[PDB]
Design a protein around this ligand. Structure first.
Ligand SMILES: Cc1cc2nc3c(=O)[nH]c(=O)nc-3n(C[C@H](O)[C@H](O)[C@H](O)COP(=O)(O)O)c2cc1C
Ligand SMILES: Cc1cc2nc3c(=O)[nH]c(=O)nc-3n(C[C@H](O)[C@H](O)[C@H](O)COP(=O)(O)O)c2cc1C
Ligand SMILES: Cc1cc2nc3c(=O)[nH]c(=O)nc-3n(C[C@H](O)[C@H](O)[C@H](O)COP(=O)(O)O)c2cc1C
Ligand SMILES: Cc1cc2nc3c(=O)[nH]c(=O)nc-3n(C[C@H](O)[C@H](O)[C@H](O)COP(=O)(O)O)c2cc1C
Ligand SMILES: Cc1ccc(Sc2snnc2C(=O)O)cc1
Ligand SMILES: Cc1ccc(Sc2snnc2C(=O)O)cc1
Ligand SMILES: Cc1ccc(Sc2snnc2C(=O)O)cc1
Ligand SMILES: Cc1ccc(Sc2snnc2C(=O)O)cc1
Lengths: 336, 336, 336, 336
């Protein structure tokens, strides 16, 4: 059976074509950051406190004032139908049942209307890649607001697509019709455009992809409502810091002014625990959601969310943290 | 032939089912701490002193005032019959002949009465997991006292069981009847309960599982008689410090007020030597005892104890330490 | 298809004999530096700046006042006909079309006249190993000047040839006639000789092979016009610093007085980006040019240059650098 | 062909039984130090100085006032007939032709008389393990003096033999008659005995096995004439410092008062260069001499010595050192 996220990764590869698997992996260039996102979590050491009453451990928290069952949410990932026919509809149903936040990608296989219809009461954010035509941008954000999306995520680390060698080999070998059956390119978007976007929507803006204290400071000066510390899973600029390492300087720059989240390499409960101890308000999952879909559709996504939540509950119990508010830097060895 | 503990590990795996071997390994989650318990010993460097009269080297020491043949004892490990039919009776006979301390698990395959009967004169401690019913707790500790146990070990790092992936896969695949032929769950136990336990027994209490100076300080404030620095062999919360590394801060906090012991990753004589140099009064063995049983029953446990004692005698001879009292931090490179 | 330099490396090995491949690899002794030239690039971490207008990114720069399309040039490598029949003629045609600098080796398969004839308008430097007969040295540098070469590169790390074990085994096994169908030895050359060479030619001298601040200081005192920081690809003295690491101290010693370049281990765009951020004015490629020739002749060299230039353009776009002048130490994590 | 020491290692294994090879390897316990003796050399970085007149490079030096062709000598190794029938006679002939120092083991396959007869003019030292009977000790040292030995080497890291697992398995499996066709045990020897030995012989005493500044200081207080920094090739106490690392503190303690040498892991010319730069007067070879014998007898030992000398000459040429006196800490990166 599939008892951890790694089992879903292994089984998903068996259930997908080489081209689809290579797209879901997608490491850029030499693949240094893809590996370091995991290794950077593994080298952090935990300091547990024992003999505390852990009879009741609570994993709930809030993001942007909305309660969620655990600080484990879904990062924006394109094309869910590559993994499961029902695609984002399956993801939306699982996310609503789990009571977490689902960030829908700007390149979903299904329309926003069809995704919302699959799970009307789900908590969702929308990640939109802006275009040159601001008439389209305005219409899209107004559409998202009409459909009940609660925040807009602007991903800033993809002005051009990363250089993923396996995808490129696969593409030069096969016709687009088979590669996509069974281009982008936004480099001009800048802080100027962010301010304009903020002026046309009442939805809070969350910037995804920040890795430096300098960009975190600019984000705060532009009055955004949150930041997802992320290196896009090592799929964009490679040889940048692991996201769990970049989190430290972003949190130190922000000093609690706005919520800071992260994604990249979260696979087990202690990874979630470490991100929370280092200052993140919640983590987001990229590839594990696609592995869940590829293995079992809606039930696979739900199982991935449930397993990671159970692992977080277990390590909070073992480490002595009764609730998310009790997870602090004291848990981290020299770092903290 | 089996000439070192590693040979017993390899041969034991051949002599056991996959399910039983996976239980004896039992690493939690990604298995980081299981590996680091060994690697942390290997990276410490020794500073030998030569041209000393080592014609007579003595490995004897005392724990809680009782003399033992070497500072090498048996940590509590459940279900010895998984490895050898006679189980704990075989272990008890070997431990008595070796003249070391045997800590009997709270989940032994045989009753305390039958284990004591197998080796009436053996030096033994009892590790008891407490239950909600204090009538049962009182009866068990009084029973242990009646049977000649000399200390109670309270393991504090298991309020819930660790997440061991291989065991979980094996369990979901097989019926309990085959998995256990051929649940727990104490999270409420806290410092409050320790004080009550101390008030109902005259037996000294030894806390097992402490990894931090903060919990060591609390242990001393509660007047316990000893501490076993341990991460439960990397079977509970993973990604915590190796036990030989945690030993340093616990020893520094305790400053000789009470005896400090350790387990986790001890496989060769220099590992024992290093723990003693860093301040432990003795080490305890977990898995090697089960490997000894799986290979040869009583004789296997005795051989594991004899081999490790001979290795300790050899490295004390080579390093210039005539007795256990002469093993000091001067032997350790920058650390000390 | 071949989509990155690593693909050219793999395909080139398939297209060459063991003897020719071993010569192109050619690591000295235990091969420590050959590997470290790559590992030293991979461990440096980048700090990208996002939300900048990267609609136009320019990779052009100048070396010795001459504009080139990207800071990616060809280091001197002997015997191009080992890789492709047309040898240096193919390399020269590709270099001219790419508009970069081609440094021709002192041991080319074709005469300088035939190479220049293949691409009359190409930007070229000449690397000459000096001989004891200064009449010959004078004639060669005057010849190079007559043919339009724009600088002389003096390689200083080869007073004797490095000890390449595979080449040596191959040589003792085969007759020179097969090994070279299908000795050196300049240890006396010193600073005295450099000054004399400078007095007989109006061409600027670039020293290749400097790894230390002491030799960089001597180079500046002798008024040379540039330095290529290089360890000869780990083919000469092994167990020296990786070239990207030696670059830092050479740049710090030079303080912008003369241009500093580097070679050794450059395989992807971020390696070029890192060398430029650390102070190099451009990088040179050794083995990748031979891999390009072995795979596809002129078109292979052109593809290697085009691919690396496209990778540099991509990582400049992702990291926020609009032009080469904007690539600074701010991009490098603690180092800088 | 065999072009480096590693080739001799590989070929020797093919030419020996498993039992003999395991004895020549002989790592103790987990084999940490055997590997670190090599790794510690590989991680040191060299700083070459170029453009010097290296037309003449001289590898000669002196030890105890006697000139040798290179600072590369033969450490005491027991039982040369395990590798080649003529054993030490072959080694002695090669050592005399190479003009280096041969230290004969206390457990040679041939008598001192027969070894000296094979090469009367060779420069030799004698390593003698002392016994309880001082009548025998006196006779042996007087015998060595009569035979022209020029120094006595006292190995101090073997009060008991190291625990070599492979040897032990082989021994328990086979009868001594086959294991030795085709016990020790000196732990009482101490500083008291050294002073007595010094009083009965006019031969200079060299202590082998010192790893600490404390024992180096005691050696100087006892007025010995030299020290070989050595961990016995990782065959005795394991998990001690690599010998090239221990050399630094011994050299710092000695401050040039007496000659300091080293063995352990020397396999290539730069290893010799590094030991000399860090303060050793010469290095000694253990296993490579046995590999030379196993492959080709006398000619194999001579080839090993010649190859390592040629590698030292080459790296001195490349690094800018005209003679052994010019090899200094300036060659070593941050360390020095
Ligand atoms: C198949 C795939 C598609 C992705 N598509 C997007 C996308 O449309 N928008 C975006 O902001 N990030 C995208 N990402 C990046 C993810 O949001 C996330 O940053 C990344 O996968 C790192 O998290 P992980 O380690 O959990 O996979 C994608 C990642 C994958 C694997
Ligand atoms: C099969 C097995 C069962 C165990 N059962 C217990 C137990 O009942 N109580 C306890 O305190 N620790 C238990 N442990 C943990 C051990 O006491 C010990 O902390 C651990 O194995 C680390 O030592 P080692 O590296 O020598 O194996 C168990 C370990 C194993 C391998
Ligand atoms: C086959 C081959 C031949 C070489 N010939 C020369 C040469 O004639 N002159 C010189 O200065 N360097 C020579 N080099 C060294 C290269 O200029 C360059 O320093 C080295 O290959 C490191 O760059 P790389 O990592 O890109 O290969 C040679 C390297 C190779 C691989
Ligand atoms: C087969 C063998 C036998 C040895 N016998 C002795 C001996 O009789 N006396 C001694 O002082 N060291 C002995 N040594 C240790 C060597 O002198 C030397 O310290 C060691 O091999 C490390 O050098 P290496 O790395 O070059 O092998 C022996 C080593 C080997 C491999
Ligand atoms: C037009 C187009 C081109 C490429 C993609 S893939 C995507 S977009 N943002 N991030 C990713 C990613 O795979 O990480 C989607 C649509
Ligand atoms: C009811 C029950 C459930 C699980 C076990 S196994 C045990 S208990 N304390 N430690 C371990 C361990 O395996 O490390 C024993 C009994
Ligand atoms: C006579 C002769 C001898 C050897 C070579 S190979 C060369 S020369 N400078 N560098 C290299 C190298 O291969 O790195 C060329 C000509
Ligand atoms: C009686 C006897 C016992 C063992 C040996 S082997 C030797 S002695 N000193 N060092 C070694 C070594 O192998 O490193 C030789 C003779």
């Amino acid at each position: 059976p599939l008892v951890c996220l790694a089992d879903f990764k292994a089984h998903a590869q068996k259930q997908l074509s080489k081209t689809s698997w290579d797209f879901i992996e997608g490491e850029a260039d030499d693949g240094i950051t893809y590996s370091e996102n995991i290794a950077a979590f593994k080298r952090i050491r935990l300091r547990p406190r024992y003999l505390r009453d852990m009879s009741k451990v609570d994993t709930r928290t809030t993001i942007q004032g909305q309660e969620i069952s655990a600080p484990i949410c879904i990062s924006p990932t394109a094309f869910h139908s590559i993994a499961w026919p029902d695609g984002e509809k399956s993801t939306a149903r699982a996310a609503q049942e789990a009571n977490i936040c689902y960030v829908i990608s700007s390149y979903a296989s299904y329309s926003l209307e069809d995704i919302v219809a699959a799970a009307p009461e789900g908590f969702r954010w929308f990640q939109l890649y802006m275009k040159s035509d601001w008439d389209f941008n305005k219409q899209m954000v107004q559409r998202a607001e009409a459909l009940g999306f609660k925040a807009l995520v602007i991903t800033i680390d993809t002005p051009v697509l990363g250089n993923r060698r396996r995808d490129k080999r696969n593409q030069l070998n096969l016709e687009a019709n088979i590669l996509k059956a069974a281009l982008f390119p936004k480099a001009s978007f800048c802080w100027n455009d962010l301010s304009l976007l903020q002026s046309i929507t009442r939805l809070p803006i969350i910037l995804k992809g920040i890795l430096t204290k300098e960009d975190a400071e600019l984000a705060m000066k532009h009055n955004v409502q949150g930041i997802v510390v992320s290196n896009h899973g090592g799929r964009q600029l490679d040889e940048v810091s692991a996201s769990i390492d970049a989190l430290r300087e972003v949190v130190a720059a922000v000093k609690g002014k706005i919520e800071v989240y992260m994604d990249g390499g979260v696979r087990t409960g202690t990874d979630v625990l470490k991100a929370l101890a280092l200052g993140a308000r919640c983590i987001f999952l990229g590839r594990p959601i696609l592995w869940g879909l590829a293995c079992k559709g809606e039930d696979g996504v739900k199982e991935v969310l449930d397993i990671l939540t159970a692992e977080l509950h277990r390590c909070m119990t073992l480490s002595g943290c009764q609730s998310v508010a009790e997870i602090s830097p004291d848990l981290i060895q020299f770092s903290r």
